[PDB]
Amino acid sequence: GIPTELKPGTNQFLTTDDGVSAPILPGFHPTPPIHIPGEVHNLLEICRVETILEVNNLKTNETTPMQRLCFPVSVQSKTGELCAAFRADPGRDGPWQSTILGQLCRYYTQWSGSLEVTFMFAGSFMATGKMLIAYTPPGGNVPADRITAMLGTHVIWDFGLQSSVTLVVPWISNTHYRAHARAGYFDYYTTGIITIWYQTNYVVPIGAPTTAYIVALAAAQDNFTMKLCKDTEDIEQTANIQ
Amino acid sequence: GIPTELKPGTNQFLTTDDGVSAPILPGFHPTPPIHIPGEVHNLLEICRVETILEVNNLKTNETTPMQRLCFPVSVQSKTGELCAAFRADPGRDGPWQSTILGQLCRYYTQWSGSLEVTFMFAGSFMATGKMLIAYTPPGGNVPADRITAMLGTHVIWDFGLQSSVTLVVPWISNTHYRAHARAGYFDYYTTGIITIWYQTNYVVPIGAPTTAYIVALAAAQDNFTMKLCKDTEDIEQTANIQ
Amino acid sequence: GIPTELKPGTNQFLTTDDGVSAPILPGFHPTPPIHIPGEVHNLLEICRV
Amino acid sequence: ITAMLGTHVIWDFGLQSSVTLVVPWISNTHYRAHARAGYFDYYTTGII
Amino acid sequence: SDRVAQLTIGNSTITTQEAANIVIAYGEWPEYCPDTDATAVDKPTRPDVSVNRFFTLDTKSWAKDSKGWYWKFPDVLTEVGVFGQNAQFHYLYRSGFCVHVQCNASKFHQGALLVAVLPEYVLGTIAGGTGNENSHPPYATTQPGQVGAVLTHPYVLDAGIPLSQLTVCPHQWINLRTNNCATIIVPYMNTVPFDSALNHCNFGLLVIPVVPLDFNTGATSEIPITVTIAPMCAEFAGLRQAVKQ
Amino acid sequence: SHENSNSASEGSTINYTTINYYKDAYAASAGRQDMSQDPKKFTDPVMDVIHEMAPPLK
Amino acid sequence: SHENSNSASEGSTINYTTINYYKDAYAASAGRQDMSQDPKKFTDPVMDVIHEMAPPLK
Amino acid sequence: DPIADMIRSLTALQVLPTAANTEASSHRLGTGVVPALQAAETGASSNASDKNLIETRCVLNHHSTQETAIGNFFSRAGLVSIITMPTTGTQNTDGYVNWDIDLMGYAQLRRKCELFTYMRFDAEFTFVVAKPNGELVPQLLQYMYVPPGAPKPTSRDSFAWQTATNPSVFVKMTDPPAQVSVPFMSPASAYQWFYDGYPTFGEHLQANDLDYGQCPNNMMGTFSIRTVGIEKSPHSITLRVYMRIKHVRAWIPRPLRNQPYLFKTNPNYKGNDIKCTSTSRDKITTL
Amino acid sequence: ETGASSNASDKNLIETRCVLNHHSTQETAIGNFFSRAGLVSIITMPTTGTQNTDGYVNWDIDLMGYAQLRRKCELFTYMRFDAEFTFVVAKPNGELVPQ
Amino acid sequence: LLQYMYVPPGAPKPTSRDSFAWQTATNPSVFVKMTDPPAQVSVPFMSPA
Ligand SMILES: CCCCCCCCCCCCC/C=C\[C@H](O)[C@H](N)CO
Ligand SMILES: CCCCCCCCCCCCC/C=C\[C@H](O)[C@H](N)CO
Ligand SMILES: [Cl-]
Ligand SMILES: [Cl-]
Ligand SMILES: [Cl-]
Ligand SMILES: [Cl-]
Ligand SMILES: [Cl-]
Ligand SMILES: [Cl-]
Ligand SMILES: [Cl-]
Ligand SMILES: [Cl-]
Ligand SMILES: [Cl-]
Ligand SMILES: [Cl-]
Ligand SMILES: [K+]
Ligand SMILES: [K+]
Ligand SMILES: [K+]
Ligand SMILES: [K+]
Ligand code: NA
């Protein structure tokens, strides 16, 4: 017979090895395929789709979860008030976990790219207002006041026929890729902080609600990619599935 | 020697693996072949051949099995009477089990195609009559009366010099293939019901039998195919063969 | 199967053997390289210093 | 839910103050005589 | 010129002066089943205008505390007009749909409905609360008919999945300050070319108030929501007697 | 390798795309099966060929 | 070796550079994955195409 | 001729091996153009990109998109079943086991598949067997596939093990793990993880509401296993089955499961303890 | 009576649509039906008893002792073929020893 | 019989000999016997730098 020599690795079963295995049904032919709408080829196709961000993820909401899908704005009495804040880290525990983007990138160890958060105002047509939305890259904790937040990347949103506005969280990192950030050494990969401030005020005339809500949708932009496929922390077989 | 590495599957014996094994008799030459009529190449060649359907599969017949090979028609006193009924499911227990088609498709898990049942009238030459044969696709149990059965696919047969007529059970399924139907979740794959009714009446003059029989032959049409080879339930080694 | 015959050396692990081993992450792509001053290719480059 | 099965238009109030319902000629005869209770109800056009 | 629109099919026409475009699910228009994909051999019946037209179902009332509703297709129409009759007399059915959900208020009301289409909307039960009981939804819940049903736990769509991600499906929003309707065109989606209109619901239509309705007292409080749907390219096969289920 | 022609199926090879490393052909694998058929010898073995148009008995 | 075309992915092969030693295609490896995408069907399934320049509602 | 009345997809595929580049942009000050403003009501996601909201530099991005191709996401062997044949107890002192093929018993793989509504693929099954404590002994086993309708063995020596037509594998617990390729076998064009319907016609009385969601097109039969011998084997056996999807296609993405799984055959969830998709905090204004 | 099977097809009995059928006929080729290893014999050499405490056994080759394979072959009157024989051996309880 | 598994940063670490994490549906795992030769694999360059 032909001279061979077994090398290390012999007999091992590597779950990700892409090899050839003998076929159990010789000459078998599958049912032909038919056309079905909605075929996907790459997870990135999905990551570009906006899904709802749970900015209002309060402990007091847990029993009325629906209230987590949108946060409020209302007639202010003082100027420059902070409306809401949250981290931009998409693979981190928090608001992003509710998005399909967040869930999917948790199946990968690293990511790279610019993100996009679109805010839709759901108040009455008679309500007007201007908000300042800011992205503060790494380094400074939550800006203390609007005048400090204003120094970062931001958008000044005006309510009108266009119900929504888009804040861009441009990829501003030192490394080409970021691993998922979390407290500790890995905070090195944090993306930053998003803050929403009252630029002027929520104004409404007599006859309309003095409080309204905003829905936040988030997704990835075209330069987004992920790498190093891994298992997600977000699912557990706590007990046997019967 | 050449660097190799054993992969999973090593040493296994897969009964359907189509490999090469060393020859025990080197230089051996078989007896030459000679011409023999009747060579077959594909089971489908056989499935197209009509064989007898046991429509009259009664518990009271079991001891006089020959009586199962044909069912009767006779002078009716009432109009629109039902003559016989049975499922079209070919791989199911019942009338089809007596056909070579039924037996063979039991060696496969799935099938697809149109079937064909040909009825031969064996009464006297002086007997006349018209029957309505219907195929009721999935959904409705056995039609209660001829006027309901009439709404499905059917053929109105007239007795004459042409002793027989052919009912076509066209392939009308949702899936491209059907697995063998049986009570339970798999009833999803049932083919349907065949019913035979008196369109007019079996009429005969003085001097001829008032009861006669019909033989039913069944087979597959040209669009018939089977897939996923498997073992048949129809044979068992109840005890040792000596 | 193809006739083979194991030769001596079979199953051994030689620390300096330069072979091929199965990849654990199929389709994985490394972070691109960037330019960094001071690349060395041969120890002799250093011995001359 | 029964009326909905006939010829209809779903009108939305807005800057366009009006909407037009068309009563298409759907008759058996080429012409209709004036309908009124009795044999002549045969020529009725229908209901809006 | 994107806010105004007219939909005319069969002997029916819909108008709207506050639209927000139209969605074509997964970018595909409905179409009759082609000979390459088909398998059933009988020539189908394609009734055209008697079934591809707009049908308006029962109206629902939106309250400051509504949880949300859903309807299953083609269940909603199995007993309406000529479409239902064809669905009953045939084993096989196939079609697409034009879904038009209506809801208008005033420039002083507020709220936002998420209107989505979810293919193969399989429902789950709360498992006896504790999760030790393997209970299942009753026919009336899986196939609510033309009246539709109410979600008990919208946050998980009564199916253990996050409402927050439903936008990954064909959808539109009816945000009172912006538009008063949603329109989605849905193509046939299934693993088989034709199927039973009775045993299998291809998709579900969900209408959930994600941003609750609100208004100052004195303003009209009856804010209905109406669903009007039209089958498109309806095809039927496997004729026999009528079956309701 | 060019072999001895001793396979059981060579008069009219029901196979034709086999694999082999030995000098004897019968050691070869089964190969891909061909799709030839001739159902007529079983379904219509009649002398005057009866058409599916006129009555089979005239 | 030239095989039987029975792979699950052949209508529009999501793969295309596979390895195989058996007569049945489905036994083949997964191969190198292609990088085709069509995000528009999910991100912009609207009739009049809204530009990123003017306001999406005119 | 004498009767006149008797007489598509706007989006397709592109190859994107790398992430999009960033073109350099400068300041834009003017009326009419307003890319930052959107209308999420349309159902479309925002079309705005970095260059429209800020001043950008040029970036030649070479990041690959290959690892997120569904093929690389799924073609990783995962556990789909654990079968045990103990020697003492109420389990299976019979020396054989018949397992109904259902892969929805383990969450990791299940959640990944349920990201889609329909999937079509081939699969590589690997069978890892050992004693319950991980030790190995010279035991001969036989694994057999019994498609729907084939006689299931009723004993360690039932005639069914003659396996004249069904495919069987004979392997030792000491040999490496057995491994085979399986084709796409549904009578449908694709396996479907969600079937909003019933398998048969009829009234759907609460007695048979367990029928709901059961799609026969996914029922692949039985997987049987036994120690090969007429006499009982003295060893308890633990068989772990791994599946690796290959040659895959997928349709219609859906929200990912966010409540623990309770049953193999349905999406039932524990109603008294409905988990929030995201962790919580005290104030919306504080991290 | 002629001995022929019916020549009628769907299009003659009903109105049909066009169907481009791609269902394969390959799996029913006799080669794929038969080329699947099946049990044809079980031979035993026990150490105690009246069986074969001799350490050897002579078996007359006859493959008709097991039904599954036999019924398949008997579907035909004559068959010509080559064969691959596999010999699976172990102790009666399935254990293996260096013999 | 042993199982070696790679748990990238962020992946759930097994907490017991039978933690669900060993289902290894996405992480790469190697199953080998102490009697087989030594397992061997190739690893790519994985830093985000
Ligand atoms: C000799 C080794 C035989 C191995 C045979 C394994 C066949 C398994 C085929 C995989 C089928 C995919 C799973 C299909 C459906 C899901 O389990 C459903 N949820 C069950 O209801
Ligand atoms: C070293 C290994 C030797 C293996 C030799 C096995 C030779 C067996 C040849 C197969 C012959 C086909 C069976 C022929 C006839 C049937 O058994 C008859 N029914 C017996 O009367
Ligand atoms: Cl040699
Ligand atoms: Cl992150
Ligand atoms: Cl050598
Ligand atoms: Cl059947
Ligand atoms: Cl071989
Ligand atoms: Cl809720
Ligand atoms: Cl073949
Ligand atoms: Cl790849
Ligand atoms: Cl045995
Ligand atoms: Cl485990
Ligand atoms: K292998
Ligand atoms: K061999
Ligand atoms: K190696
Ligand atoms: K690029
Ligand atoms: Na814009």
Author numbering:
A (entry chain C), B (entry chain C): 1 to 242
C (entry chain C): 1 to 49
D (entry chain C): 147 to 194
E (entry chain B): 10 to 254
F (entry chain D), G (entry chain D): 12 to 69
H (entry chain A): 2 to 8, 18 to 297
I (entry chain A): 51 to 149
J (entry chain A): 150 to 198
Can you quote the paper on this entry?
Enterovirus 71 (EV71) and coxsackievirus A16 (CVA16) are subgroup A human enteroviruses (HEVA), small, nonenveloped single-stranded RNA (ssRNA) viruses whose protective capsid mediates cell entry and humoral immune responses. The external portion of the icosahedral capsid comprises 60 copies of viral proteins VP1, -2, and -3 arranged with pseudo T=3 symmetry, while their N-terminal extensions and 60 copies of VP4 line the interior, surrounding the RNA genome. There is a “canyon” (a depression encircling the 5-fold axes) on the surface of enteroviruses that often harbors the receptor binding site, and there is a fatty acid binding site below the canyon base, within the hydrophobic β-barrel core of VP1. Here, we remedy this with high resolution X-ray structures of both mature and natural empty CVA16 particles and also of empty recombinant viruslike particles of CVA16 produced in insect cells, a potential vaccine antigen.
CVA16 (strain Ningbo.CHN/028-2/2009) was grown in Vero cells and formaldehyde inactivated prior to purification. The sedimentation coefficients and λ260/λ280 absorbance ratios were ∼160S and 1.67 for the mature virus, and ∼80S and 0.64 for the empty particle, indicating that the latter does not contain RNA, and SDS-PAGE showed that VP0 is not cleaved into VP4 and VP2 in the empty particle. Diffraction data for inactivated CVA16 empty and full virus particles to 2.7- and 2.65-Å resolution, respectively, were collected at room temperature in situ. The crystals of both mature and empty particles belong to the same space group, P41212, with similar unit cell dimensions of a = b = 491 Å and c = 709 Å. The mature CVA16 virus particle contains VP1 to -4 and is well ordered apart from residues 1 and 9 to 17 of VP1, 1 to 9 of VP2, and 1 to 11 of VP4. The most significant differences are on the outer surface, including the BC loop and C-terminal residues 280 to 297 of VP1 and, in VP3, residues 58 to 66 leading to the B strand and the C-terminal residues 233 to 239. Thus, residues 59 to 62 and 65 to 69 of VP3 form 2 short helices linked by a tight turn in CVA16, compared to a loop and a longer helix (62 to 69) in EV71. VP1 contains a bound pocket factor, modeled as sphingosine (similar to EV71).
